[PDB]
């Protein structure tokens, strides 16, 4: 029991790390999937 909560605390700290990493990739375009959808959005409006 004295060790169970230590894993829980790291889980919260580690959870924010992954979320911060994924979101950061979007702001700069590292996530290639997001860029492909984004360029589609721009093309439709200009064509529209």
């Amino acid at each position: 029991l004295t060790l169970l909560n230590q894993e829980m605390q790291n889980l919260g700290i580690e959870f924010k790390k992954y979320m911060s990493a994924q979101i950061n990739d979007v702001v700069i375009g590292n996530d290639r999937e997001f860029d492909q959808d984004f360029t589609k959005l721009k093309a439709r409006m200009v064509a529209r």
């Binding site: 911060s20 950061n24 702001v27 700069i28 590292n30």
Partner: protein, 48 residues
């Protein structure tokens, strides 16, 4: 050091600039240099 700075890319320091500031989502052009020093220094420190 030679390998570390040789592979240095503008698309690696600017990655950390967004992370350092949870609120702001737009870093100035000048912030590239500042993050370069810490990225190129903290990584070097771990080597020792």
């Amino acid at each position: 050091l030679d390998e570390l700075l040789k592979t240095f890319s503008v698309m690696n320091a600017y990655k950390r600039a967004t992370e350092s500031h949870p609120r702001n989502s737009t870093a100035p052009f000048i912030a590239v240099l500042v993050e370069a020093l810490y990225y190129l220094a903290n990584e070097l420190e771990d080597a020792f």
